[PDB]
């Protein structure tokens, strides 16, 4: 029985690998060999957002592409007007340790979470004139690593208990609980259509679920270590995983395989953040090596380096309109890089 | 810059002033990361020193010694198989590792956990304050004699009490040998790799012990003294 169950699981896995190999005929590099490779890309730090007291673990651009929110270990969530560097808001936090933050798609709310296992969501636009805890979501038995907003009433969180959760804000209860992961889940990326969402974990696997029904639609493996960051492709049919093995791997939803590995022998430090550009051609990945890399998502070459941070780049986000890329590192500094020409 | 942008700028200036006011306090206090086995009396030390504030999760305990504030962080109700959140605590002043010395069944697991914490990549420069808690229970158990450390550790037979060791005058010599054998077991891993970057401070404490705050303050003073020696180009 149990031995037979393991044997049939192994046969199903082998059939999966055989089907993937049958579907695999040409690497995307061979297809893109005819495209013009992008030249060296240099990005200037237009603004530096000074004011955080310690290392910054997360940031999230607003959907207006102007306001951003950043979370640091001093128990502080600072909302900056990136255009003029002005500090729009400064929210003190109940727990000094938050490893994530988020911005509501409407912009009315912000979210944070960390080692307290509670997702604290704050209402920015209150008649009270100040910021208050709109809700404190509880139900996770591990540290919360990343939370993203489907809308003003639905949120999606991932935690260190190898579970993700979909929370209805009014009820404050886990509408759906995604439990298919073996290791700790770090990063989740909401699909542009917000019907599916992917999340990478410690078991060297990225699982893509659907929010409505709530089962693991797809599972992607290939990484050798814990997957640290994840980001959906702008079209929603692919995503990218950055892990501790110092390689970024691009997975394709429809093919259900691994496209290429953005790995360079020069760099050995693991990945801390991965995100795409508006057109999806540039993949920007912050590393433990105190600087970020910018690869060509279809040629797997290092098209540029973003090196202005004295410490490791913990978080890195791209505006919805693709105007700039804001990177927050452990030296308390958020740098808004942008093109030159 | 218009009127509204100027008002936003003054709002940002007020926020920056509040940020500096908070930076004073943040730099004024030292953050300590408390770790230990589930049974290793860590909550007992936390309660004996001060009162914690939950919110499984984070346990905050702010205590003041000699006008210096320390902030102990107990990460409970979590699976300690990798401690992958430890990257958050890569800047703590000290890691307070509390180990129950009266459980030889879990003593090897505690030693392995200390080996993992000491040789951790992110805690390379973070010093460890080692609290060998529950000394009274250890003394009672080794005084009873029905439990032998020899069957758990075969190097106890060839182990002798160090000449450095300072025991209490009314304390049994076998108690001293057991205590210092466990302390040397920890210090072996402490000295295997931690030569200059960080140090392990061992302490013998019990549940009724009340000077743990003073020991933590002194160890933090030594840690910051060495940190300033390295930083101010004296080392």
């Amino acid at each position: 029985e149990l031995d037979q169950l393991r044997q049939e699981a192994e046969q199903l896995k082998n059939q999966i690998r055989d089907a993937r190999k049958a579907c695999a005929d040409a690497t995307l590099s061979q297809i893109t060999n005819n495209i013009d490779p992008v030249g060296r890309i240099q990005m200037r730090t237009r603004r530096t957002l000074r004011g955080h007291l310690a290392k910054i673990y997360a940031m999230h651009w607003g959907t207006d592409s102007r306001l951003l929110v950043s979370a640091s270990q001093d128990g502080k969530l600072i909302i900056w007007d990136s255009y003029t560097t002005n500090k729009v808001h400064a929210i003190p936090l109940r727990s000094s340790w938050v490893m994530t933050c988020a911005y509501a798609p409407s912009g009315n709310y912000v979210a944070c979470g960390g080692l307290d296992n509670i997702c604290s969501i704050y209402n920015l636009k209150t008649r009270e004139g100040n910021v208050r805890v709109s809700r404190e979501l509880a139900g996770h038995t591990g540290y919360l690593s990343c939370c993203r907003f489907l809308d003003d009433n639905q949120i999606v969180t991932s935690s260190g208990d190898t579970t993700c959760a979909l929370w209805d804000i009014e009820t404050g209860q886990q509408t759906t609980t995604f439990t298919g992961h073996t290791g700790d889940v770090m990063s989740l990326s909401l699909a542009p259509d917000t019907r599916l969402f992917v999340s990478g974990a410690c078991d060297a696997s990225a699982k893509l679920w659907d929010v409505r029904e709530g089962m693991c639609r797809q599972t992607f493996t290939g990484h050798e270590s814990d997957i640290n960051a994840i980001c959906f492709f702008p079209n929603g049919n692919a995503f990218a995983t950055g892990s501790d093995d110092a390689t970024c791997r691009l997975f394709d939803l429809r093919a259900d395989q691994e496209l290429m590995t953005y790995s360079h022998d020069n760099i050995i430090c693991g990945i801390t953040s991965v995100s795409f550009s508006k057109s999806g051609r540039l993949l920007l990945a912050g590393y433990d090596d105190f600087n970020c890399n910018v690869w060509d998502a279809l040629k797997a070459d290092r098209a540029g380096v973003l090196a202005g941070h004295d410490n490791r780049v913990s978080c890195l986000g791209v505006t919805d309109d693709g105007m700039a890329v804001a990177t927050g590192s452990w030296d308390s500094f958020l740098k808004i890089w942008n093109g030159s020409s | 810059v218009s009127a509204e942008d100027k008002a936003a700028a003054e709002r940002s200036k007020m926020i920056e002033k509040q940020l500096q006011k908070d930076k004073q306090v943040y730099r004024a206090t030292h953050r300590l990361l408390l770790l230990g086995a589930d049974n290793s009396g860590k909550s007992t030390i936390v309660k004996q020193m001060r009162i914690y504030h939950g919110g499984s999760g984070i346990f905050e305990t702010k205590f003041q010694v000699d006008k210096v504030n320390f902030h102990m962080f107990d990460v409970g109700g979590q699976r300690d198989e990798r401690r992958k959140w430890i990257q958050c605590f890569n800047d703590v002043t000290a890691i307070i590792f509390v180990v129950d010395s009266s459980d030889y069944n879990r003593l090897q697991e505690a030693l392995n956990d200390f080996k993992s914490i000491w040789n951790n990549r992110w805690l390379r420069t973070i010093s460890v304050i080692l609290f060998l808690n529950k000394q009274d229970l250890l003394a009672e158990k080794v005084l009873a004699g029905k439990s032998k450390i020899e069957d758990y550790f075969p190097e106890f037979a060839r182990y002798t009490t160090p000449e450095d060791a300072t025991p209490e005058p009314g304390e049994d010599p076998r108690v001293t040998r057991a205590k210092y054998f466990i302390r040397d077991e920890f210090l072996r891993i402490s000295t295997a790799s931690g030569d200059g970057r960080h140090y392990c401070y061992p302490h013998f404490t019990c549940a009724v012990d009340t000077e743990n705050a003073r020991r933590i303050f002194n160890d933090c003073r030594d840690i910051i003294q060495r940190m300033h020696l390295r930083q101010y180009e004296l080392l």
Partner: single-chain antibody
Amino acid sequence: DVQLVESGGGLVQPGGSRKLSCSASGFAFSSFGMHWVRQAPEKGLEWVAYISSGSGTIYYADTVKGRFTISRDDPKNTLFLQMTSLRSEDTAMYYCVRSIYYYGSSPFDFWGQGTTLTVSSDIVMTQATSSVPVTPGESVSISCRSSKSLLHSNGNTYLYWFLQRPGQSPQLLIYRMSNLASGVPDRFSGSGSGTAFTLTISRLEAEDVGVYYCMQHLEYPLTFGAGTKL
């Protein structure tokens, strides 16, 4: 909650100084800048004074410069105007108005129930139209003009539209032409270019009867405009 009560006023002599207080209850007064605004009897409005959060910036109107003062008591959540050498033109309604300034904010949120005072260059607003039929169910548009275009380099045009009910304090309708206040229903809208400003109402209800006012915020003289009665 979020209410600005006011006290003081009454019949006063021209040579007597007066204290006119506004107390804020139900919102964070410390982080809000404040304004004092005057309403002449059966006339338009005119901004009198302003003080930023923390008393960093204090601005006074050109007509009352040198004899008026403002200061804030944050622990008591109080803002009082001290008035010296009262004139015959100070016989008017007075309103204490909260104002918070950041990106996306509506920096005239609540106008408290003011107090009456009885005594025994700058941007100008035209608002040529002054009388409109009170027939409901129509689609009335209220027009306005500015001496200088309110559009700035940033992109936001600092035009504000208020409605003052016959027996209640004025309320925000629009804090900027392309956006609408919180408590105001989706019935109102604003649109325009340069100096030409228009307020549009799709359907007219009985609670929409009042006086409409327009204001600029590009220049801190903050001169109002002559109201329009429906």
